[PDB]
Amino acid sequence: TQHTSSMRGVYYPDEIFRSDTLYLTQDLFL
Amino acid sequence: LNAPATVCGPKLSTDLIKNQCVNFNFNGLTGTGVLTPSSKRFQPFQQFGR
């Protein structure tokens, strides 16, 4: 079968505390 | 420094001087400023904030 992966599989990009921001990054994402 | 530091060179360590303009050095991360207690919740893989 096939299904869809709706907004799954996002991970923390790096090891830095951030709060109340919007952060734009480029990596390998699903 | 994407994690806790373990391989550090031979330098001595002093005490904290809070609420005062000092020169700090935390694992090679230098600077100048004041240090106060904070209310941020670091998850146990984060060393510093941005």
Structure tokens belonging to residue B6? 């373990």
The approach used to solve this structure was cryo-EM
- Placement of tokens 């330098």 in the chain: B11
H helices present in B1-50, as ranges: none
**Angle in degrees, CA A16, B40, B38, rounded to 5:** 115
Query: What gap in Å lies between CA B2 and CA B47, rounded to an integer?
Result: 8
From chain B, the residues in CB contact with A18 under 8 A are 49-50
> What are the residues whose beta carbons fall under 8 Å from the beta carbon of B16, sequence distance 6 or more?
B35
Q: How far is A27 from chain B (nearest CA, A)?
A: 17
